[PDB]
Write a protein that binds this DNA or RNA. Structure first.
Lengths: 25, 128, 97, 63, 216
RNA sequence: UUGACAUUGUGAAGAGUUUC
RNA sequence: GGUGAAAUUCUUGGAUUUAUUGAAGACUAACUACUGCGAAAGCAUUUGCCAAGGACGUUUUCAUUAAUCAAGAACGAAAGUUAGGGGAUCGAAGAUGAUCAGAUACCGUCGUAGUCUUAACCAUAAACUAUGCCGACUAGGGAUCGGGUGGUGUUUUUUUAAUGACCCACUCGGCACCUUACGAGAAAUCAAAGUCUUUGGGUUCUGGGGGGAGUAUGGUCGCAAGGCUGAAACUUAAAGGAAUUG
């Protein structure tokens, strides 16, 4: 698959992990 | 040179063909017809033979009202579009000269801009 | 690997040009890129010329002509057979036919 | 009906995908000033005449 | 089931005095009925015409003129100078690669109150042994050229009406004068005055209207 | 709010004897 | 109308098209090129002001002031953002019409953001010449920009001129292009990608098989988007690039 696309998948996954840990406090 | 001059506006796209006629004034138009009028297929709308008959009936009405000579002015769609005339242009035009209305004073007034607004296709275009 | 010293066409000193819209496929592509072809033709094609010469007031009057500067897109051209593929040296050469 | 005739000046060549059609030039045989191109179906050589319904079309390459 | 074509009357379009073939032609107008006027529907009209037809000259084939309906009179109607224009195949022939295309403009009023924008054009040229292949000019070149062209434009439109302006336009006085002026800098072939537009016009002035008309 | 009737006179012009 | 072809869509409200006039906001075509400018990103109608800058020229001036540079700093497409203004056009979104096994897409129709700018931000792209900067040197040719030298040159008409351009010849500084490979190369291909096992001109920075991984954490800047830095286990004997033959 595309590298730009892998990179964006990771961008979202990281934003999500951040949302999680922020809810976790 | 007593023959009265109108003007025939030939808009020749590939979607259809317009043979419009007025007097030398664009106001009080005389005759207006297409191949989109002269056949029901929806594919050959702009095609020569249909625009051929378009010019045929144009000349017919030109006579029935008494118009005898014409200055011709052709255009493609223009603006920012293909910028090329359609085959209906030549077809109706030749057929006009054949039908025998006096012909003259040819030109292409197809509008051309100074680098004007953007186009359909979004940088990457109507890819087929 | 590299296939053209051009890298396609000649910018080769500036860093930028402005683009255009291909007449068929519309594609925005740079101007120093952007395959070009002039096109001169008549409006009175070789038999309708004769018909007009008879149907014409203003004898001999003129043959105006349609002048169009087509900015082509690459593959659009390639399928139009504006051009075809060429071998290594046929590519190296820059001469018209 | 507005029929006309025209004798072949030149068999231009076989265009059309299947090798059935052939481009021809014909003199309209009433006005030798009239030499027009058309397309045909069948086997053809020179000197022969076609019976033309439309004297106006003058079609082009065929596929 | 009405056929207005057997209802509309006909009228004869006539040109100003500075033209020779002033019988411009014929046109169709609906019959002036009650509470609606053929003459007004005609007043609201304009017509484009080739200068070769205006003058009989085949040198005048490319210049073309809008002519505006000012006065309608008893199957006839007097036209005014509405503006000139310049055919397109000629332009695109003229405009070629390997040279510098130049344009100049100015807005100015006539002697009489006619506000006019004017547009002239020219192109660079090689000279008789110049083996290099483009013959471009420089910034100062183009700048002073456009400067002087605008200068002369303002001068001669000042010293004129629509009448004097057109009377100089037909013989192409202006191109020759700009050539005389701009020869000092550069060869600069292919001088033309491409376009002119009427922006503002004075009150109707039927007197001078008939004056310029009122003959033939 | 819509329409009418009057307040409401003075001239014209004109579409379908008309009264708009 | 619009297309491979269709359809949506608009049309007694007379559309499409004709024409007069006006507005809007837009972008600056043909000139537009193996040509210019600029730190790069990038930069074009017109005109005026502001200051700046290169090259050239220069029997001007000062005398080593400088070259590369971690840290630190100014710039930085497009997208994006906050608040105003502006929003013709296009147009992720979005809704529709087609096609097709489906189409959540290509394609047709409409159309929101933005697209325009403004006061602040963000600091990323093939931001590529994928070739660090400073300086030395080596091999020819002809184009060519700008500056510069000469011409009992051309042309420009006047009374020579002066000038203006143009041609020939020569020189600085730029874009670069072509032949040959002398040299280099893995091979492509390169007058620098040469001077290199005969291994050293100065200087900054970067890289060590692939995956995991610019992932994770932490720090830190950022309103956000995100950015800067930046792992590890674990898994892996192939991945990889140049050229040929098929």
């Amino acid at each position: 698959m595309r590298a730009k696309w892998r990179k964006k998948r990771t961008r979202r996954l990281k934003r999500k992990r951040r949302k999680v840990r922020a809810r976790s406090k | 040179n007593s023959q009265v001059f109108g003007v025939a506006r030939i808009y020749a796209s590939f979607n259809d063909t317009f043979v419009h006629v007025t007097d030398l004034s664009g106001k009080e138009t005389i005759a207006r017809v297409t191949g989109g009028m002269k056949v029901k297929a929806d594919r050959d709308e702009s095609s020569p033979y249909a625009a051929m008959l378009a010019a045929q009936d144009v000349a017919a009405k030109c006579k029935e009202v008494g118009i005898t000579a014409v200055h011709v002015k052709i255009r493609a769609t223009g603006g920012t579009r293909t910028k090329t005339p359609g085959p209906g242009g030549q077809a109706a035009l030749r057929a006009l000269a054949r039908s025998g209305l006096r012909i003259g004073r040819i030109e292409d007034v197809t509008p051309v801009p100074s680098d004007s607004t953007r186009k359909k296709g979004g940088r990457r275009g109507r890819r087929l | 690997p590299k296939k053209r010293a051009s890298n396609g066409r000649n910018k080769k000193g500036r860093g930028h040009v402005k683009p255009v819209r291909c007449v068929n496929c519309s594609k925005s592509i740079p101007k120093d890129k952007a395959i070009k072809r002039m096109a001169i033709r008549n409006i009175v094609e070789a038999a309708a010329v004769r018909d007009l010469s008879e149907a014409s007031v203003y004898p001999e009057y003129a043959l105006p002509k349609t002048y169009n500067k087509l900015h082509y897109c690459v593959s659009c051209a390639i399928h139009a057979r504006i051009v075809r593929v060429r071998s290594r040296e046929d590519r190296k050469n820059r001469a018209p036919p | 009906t507005p029929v006309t005739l025209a004798k072949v000046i030149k068999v231009l060549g076989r265009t059309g995908s299947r090798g059935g059609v052939t481009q021809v030039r014909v003199e309209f045989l009433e006005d030798t000033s009239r030499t027009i191109v058309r397309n045909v179906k069948g086997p053809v050589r020179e000197n022969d005449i076609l019976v033309l319904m439309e004297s106006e079309r003058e079609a082009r390459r065929l596929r | 089931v009405v056929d207005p074509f057997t209802r509309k009357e006909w009228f004869d379009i006539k040109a100003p005095s500075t033209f020779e073939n002033r019988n411009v032609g014929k046109t169709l107008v609906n019959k002036s009925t009650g509470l609606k006027s053929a003459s007004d529907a005609l007043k609201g009209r304009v017509v484009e015409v080739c200068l070769a037809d205006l003058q009989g000259s085949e040198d005048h084939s490319f210049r073309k003129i809008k002519l505006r309906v000012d006065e309608v009179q008893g199957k006839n109607l007097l036209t005014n100078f509405h503006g000139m224009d310049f055919t397109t195949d000629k332009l695109r022939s003229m405009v070629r690669k390997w040279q510098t295309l130049i344009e100049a403009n100015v807005t100015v009023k006539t002697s009489d109150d006619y506000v006019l924008r004017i547009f002239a054009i020219a192109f660079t040229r090689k000279q008789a042994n110049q083996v290099k292949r483009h013959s471009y000019a420089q910034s100062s070149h183009i700048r002073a050229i456009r400067k002087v062209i605008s200068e002369i434009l303002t001068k001669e439109v000042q010293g004129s009406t629509l009448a004097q302006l057109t009377s100089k336009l037909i013989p192409e006085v202006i191109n020759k004068e700009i050539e005389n002026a701009t020869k000092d800098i550069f060869p600069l072939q292919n001088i033309h005055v491409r376009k002119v537009k009427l922006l503002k016009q004075p009150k109707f002035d039927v007197g001078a209207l008939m004056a310029l008309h009122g003959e033939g």
